[PDB]
């Protein structure tokens, strides 16, 4: 079990770790989060009590270093940093635990939610979507735009998701215009899976990461990307059987975890109704269709 200590909490802030969150008051004696499960990426995220504008946060993996949080009063935010002196870090953590100034990552033992949301998400792949190579952790916020968004303006602060565009030469083979537009299997299997992602696990990891940034930061281009990656599979007549089964599990847990009051903005009516009821794969997402109908029948 790993720990992310906090130097202090000088401003009132709601702190999230994965799907958990807690309120910390201005100058409350808060010194971090302990008992964080090893083996998964994690995200620690912030919403200041004053300016609910800009949710922001950090993706990290505790196996890749010792990370802590420190408020910067010049830039006005909680920053993640790496401590390279390992003895300095154990001593800090051990003192803060001894004084019991840390919250415990509150996982229920039966609960596989976080694993299920991050099954294919790898820190190495996150760092290619979020380019900041001097850090082992990745900053994301509500306002960052995607590469595809910038094509339709700061490149260093962009989310470099894989561009998917159904009316593009990459998607459409010359002389197969109608075939490839109505059945996207070529684009999914050859262009994207074989060509770009190499395997379905990297595809799913990007899809899961886009969902999580949409959910935790309200990042709009991330939501567009998550829906595009669903629609590309659902609009392919020929999908490996293992991918469809895993997609049904992936989406099931995403829909299960979404806050009910945010379904109005995070869920695209056209994609979901097309995917569940019109597409080639309309009959292949049994778990997802059942939870969607019982939880968001209005959308449909």
């Amino acid at each position: 079990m790993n720990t992310v200590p906090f130097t202090s909490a000088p401003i009132e802030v709601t702190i999230g770790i994965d799907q958990y969150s807690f309120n910390v008051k201005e100058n409350q004696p808060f010194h971090g989060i302990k008992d964080i499960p090893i083996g998964h990426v994690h995200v620690i995220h912030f919403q200041h009590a004053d300016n609910s504008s800009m949710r922001y946060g950090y993706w990290f993996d505790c196996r890749m270093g010792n990370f802590y949080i420190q408020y910067d009063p010049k830039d006005g935010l909680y920053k993640m940093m790496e401590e390279r002196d390992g003895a300095k870090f154990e001593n800090i953590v051990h003192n803060f635990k001894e004084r019991q100034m840390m919250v415990s990552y509150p996982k229920i033992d039966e609960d596989d939610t976080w694993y299920n949301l991050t099954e294919f998400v790898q820190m190495d792949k996150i760092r290619k979507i979020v380019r900041k190579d001097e850090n082992q952790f990745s900053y994301v916020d509500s306002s960052m735009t995607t590469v595809q968004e910038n094509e339709l303006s700061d490149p260093a602060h962009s989310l470099n998701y894989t561009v998917i565009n159904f009316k593009s030469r990459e998607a459409i083979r010359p002389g197969h215009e109608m075939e490839d537009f109505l059945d996207k299997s070529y684009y999914l299997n050859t262009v994207m899976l074989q060509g770009i992602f190499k395997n379905s696990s990297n595809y799913f990891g990007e899809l899961q990461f886009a969902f999580l940034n949409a959910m935790f930061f309200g990042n709009y281009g991330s939501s567009l990307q998550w829906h595009a990656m669903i629609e590309l599979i659902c609009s392919s007549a020929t999908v490996p059987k293992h991918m469809l089964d895993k997609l049904d599990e992936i989406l099931y847990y995403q829909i299960k975890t979404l806050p009910e009051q945010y379904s109005d903005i995070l869920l695209n009516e056209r994609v979901w109704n097309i995917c569940l009821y019109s597409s080639f794969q309309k009959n292949s997402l049994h778990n997802t269709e059942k939870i969607m109908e019982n939880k968001y029948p209005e959308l449909l």
């Binding site: 009316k167 593009s168 030469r169 215009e177 109608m178």
Partner: protein
């Protein structure tokens, strides 16, 4: 954006543009079978591709053989249209290629966009106008070349005959759309109007009769009256 009443004069500026109408591409008669089921028999069709500034009509005849063994023909018909329009553009010299293609039905937008991906600078536009180009098969010489075709064929016509020697393109297009609206609302009456006088002939190289300027004003009045009436007989007013 879409073409509508408000930006109507853009059709007659000097940027090359084409209207594409696909309403006569896939044409069928519905009939009963010996077992008393219903079946379709396709007949020859056409793509109606028109330069509204010049009167140039690229009439691509769609022979029934193109449907043989195919499924979902109404859907294929929009993609076949887009393939043939794209092939036409590619066949034209660069300085004759359109800068915009306006489709008369919105379901053509995606098929044409996908077929024209090689031409990113050609704008594909819908229209809010309810243009009467479906009535082109009520023009006798156009209907005649479609029905006689034994193979795929492109046939070229000026749909304005020689009108542009005497009138502007705006006025020529208004005349054309009036004639075609009349033919669509009441074909028999419209054709009676155009031919009632035997002394006015259609030149061998023309589609419409050789009316004088005065006779066109009378003709145009008669077609207006028809369209109001048939709107009477239809809405009882």
């Amino acid at each position: 954006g879409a073409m509508n009443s408000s930006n109507y004069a853009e059709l007659f500026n000097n940027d090359i543009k084409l209207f594409v109408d696909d309403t006569n591409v896939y044409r069928v008669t519905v009939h009963k079978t010996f077992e008393g089921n219903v079946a379709t028999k396709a007949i020859n069709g056409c793509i109606f591709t028109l330069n509204p500034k010049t009167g140039h009509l690229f009439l691509k005849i769609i022979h029934t053989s193109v449907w043989a063994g195919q499924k979902r023909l109404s859907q294929l018909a929009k993609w076949k249209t887009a393939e043939e329009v794209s092939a036409l553009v590619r066949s034209l010299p660069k300085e004759e290629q359109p800068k915009q293609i306006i489709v008369t039905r919105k379901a053509m937008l995606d098929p044409l966009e996908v077929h024209m991906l090689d031409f990113p600078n050609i704008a594909i536009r819908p229209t809010e106008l309810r243009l009467p180009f479906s009535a082109a098969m009520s023009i006798d010489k156009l209907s005649d070349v479609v029905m006689k075709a034994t193979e795929p064929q492109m046939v070229l016509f000026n749909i304005y005959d020689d009108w542009l020697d005497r009138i502007s393109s705006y006025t020529a297009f208004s005349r054309l759309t009036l004639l075609l609206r009349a033919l669509k609302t009441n074909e028999e009456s419209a054709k009676m109007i155009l031919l009632s006088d035997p002394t006015i002939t259609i030149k061998s190289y023309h589609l419409w009769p050789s009316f004088t300027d005065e006779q066109w004003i009378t003709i145009e009045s008669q077609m207006r009256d028809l369209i109001l009436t048939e709107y009477g007989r239809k809405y009882n007013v």
